[PDB]
Amino acid sequence: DPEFDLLLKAWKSSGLSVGMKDDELLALLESCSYRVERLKAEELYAIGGDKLQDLRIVGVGEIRAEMVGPSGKQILIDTLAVGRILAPALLFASENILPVTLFANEDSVLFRIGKEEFKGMMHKYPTLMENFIGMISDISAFLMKKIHQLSL
Amino acid sequence: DPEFDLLLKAWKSSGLSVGMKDDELLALLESCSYRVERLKAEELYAIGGDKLQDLRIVGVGEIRAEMVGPSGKQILIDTLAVGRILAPALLFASENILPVTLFANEDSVLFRIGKEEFKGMMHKYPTLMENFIGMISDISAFLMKKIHQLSL
């Protein structure tokens, strides 16, 4: 599959794959299903709080993303190349979901894996689990450091 | 009052326990190694940041905790009842680790399960996994909303 190959390069590029030999990777992903989101270069997209409860990974291209506060204040800008995960820390969140806006610097593709299926994928492969938990852990640690910077 | 009882009661109070059959929960703690940390009331200890890579649950008593920025500002002050997890989002974090200062209110006990072990428990009991992941997801959510609120 060509499209599957893309996903694979993306995951290899992603942080989620660290510590996995190729067999594990392929094991993980062949028996896994996903929809595809296409993003036409230089158009804008908003993704609200509840449509953010899916794993999304940049498979193709590059997008610019930023959370927006409860006031419209735009925080945490980022450029996400191939392999980055969109808003990973909010996948499994219940309260306080700021929405996010995306700008396509090029034509771009996000692979979208559903929340419940991903929940299983992590259960089947503990390395995947440690990786995803570490990912959102580091994000947290960072936010904590940026909160120091913005205090008195 | 039996040490394994404190532990067990702690977990039951904890957010980690939500949706687990008491029987599941028992078999969890049954085969579980952990040490103990005793905090004499009104003294102030400092853990962090290398030593924050272990599950700590408030077993007895009550603790005031807070993080410490690079330049000394304390942030994110909270008071942790029994069943509370100390600094969960930093357990699998690999960078930007702020340290923690605890102040006992009462005489207090923490239970320290090891990272690799806790990794294991989350594997075996998926509901524990979803719980912990969501716990730290929610923290990140909060952290963002507070970053927004400080920015002007």
In the numeric block, which tokens belong to residue B84?
């509370």
Report the distance separating Cα A129 and Cα A98, nearest Å.
24
Domain ranges of chain B: 1-152
Interchain CB contact of A132 with B (< 8 Å): yes
Name the strands in the sheet holding B108-114, side by side, starting at the edge strand that comes first in the sequence. Answer: B34-39, B108-114, B54-60
- Structural determination approach: X-ray
B111 CB burial (10 A radius; 0-12, 13-18, 19+): buried
CA dihedral B121, B125, B130, B136 (to 10 degrees): -20
Mark which residues 5-64 of B lie under 8 Å from A by CB.
Answer: none
Report the distance separating Cα A82 and Cα B10, nearest Å.
43
Q: Which amino acid is at A56?
A: R
Residue in B118, B87, B129, B139 with CA at minimum distance from that of residue A89: B139
Resolution in A: 3.2
Chain A interface disruption, residue of B73, B86, B92, B135, most A CBs within 10 A = B92
Q: Which residues contact B16 (CB under 8 A, 6 or more apart)?
A: B57, B85, B128, B131, B132, B135
Residue in A69, A74, A75, A89 with CA at minimum distance from that of residue A138: A89
Q: Which residues contact A67 (CB under 8 A, 6 or more apart)?
A: A74, A75, A76, A87, A98, A99, A100, B144, B148
Is the Cβ pair A123, B119 closer than 8 Å? no
Greatest C-alpha distance within chain A? 55
Report the distance separating Cα A79 and Cα B42, nearest Å.
47
Three-state SS across chain B?
A: CCHHHHHHHHHHHCHHHCCCCHHHHHHHHHCCCEEEEEECCCCEEEECCHHHCEEEEEEECCEEEEEECCCCCEEEEEEECCCCECCHHHCCCCCCCCCEEEEECCCEEEEEEEHHHHHHHHHHCHHHHHHHHHHHHHHHHHHHHHHHHHCC
Is the Cβ pair B142, A75 closer than 8 Å? no
Is the Cβ pair B140, A143 closer than 8 Å? yes
